[PDB]
Design a binder for this molecule. Structure first.
Ligand code: A1BSA
Ligand code: ZN
Length: 139
């Protein structure tokens, strides 16, 4: 679990979105595993606007933050699950690191701010759904 609170928006994994998230939907994309919903309280997370390939992510399965080197956002094949069939997920970034299902929603950050959230993993790897291109989150 985990979310990004920026202004009047809440960013979550699309497969983990609530009834309230769908009732106040702003935008959603199955190919990215993202869903954005409106909120009444104001958020204060800063989103990075950069091309950093190093950062720190939070891993709830270990109660620890880990430094990681990660790839540039791209189309990567993801094994079928109870939420999605076998498909290519876009805007996905991989790193060598610990993750298990339940870690989805953990924030990845560089010095410039929030880069994205845990979305895939397995085999000693971790995938993060990028959010730096969503310029409308700030405006
Ligand atoms: N983005 C997706 O399509 C997800 C949906 C949920 C399922 N999924 C997974 O990767 C996962 F849960 F099985 C997983 C397995 C081992 C380590 C992990 F950190 C994770 Br996350 C794909
Ligand atoms: Zn950065």
């Amino acid at each position: 679990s985990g979310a990004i609170y920026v202004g009047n928006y809440r960013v979550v994994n699309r497969h983990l979105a609530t009834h309230n998230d769908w009732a106040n939907l702003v935008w959603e994309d199955s190919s990215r595993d993202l869903l954005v919903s409106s909120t009444t309280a104001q958020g204060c997370d800063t989103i990075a606007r950069c091309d950093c390939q190093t950062g720190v992510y939070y891993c709830s399965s270990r109660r620890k933050h880990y430094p990681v080197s990660f790839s540039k956002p791209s189309l990567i094949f993801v094994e079928a699950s109870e939420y999605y069939p076998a498909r290519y997920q876009s805007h996905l970034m991989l790193a060598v690191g610990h993750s298990e299902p339940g870690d989805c929603g953990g924030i990845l950050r560089c010095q410039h701010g929030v880069v994205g959230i845990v979305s895939t993993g397995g085999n000693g790897l971790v995938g993060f759904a990028d959010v730096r291109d969503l310029l409308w989150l700030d405006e």
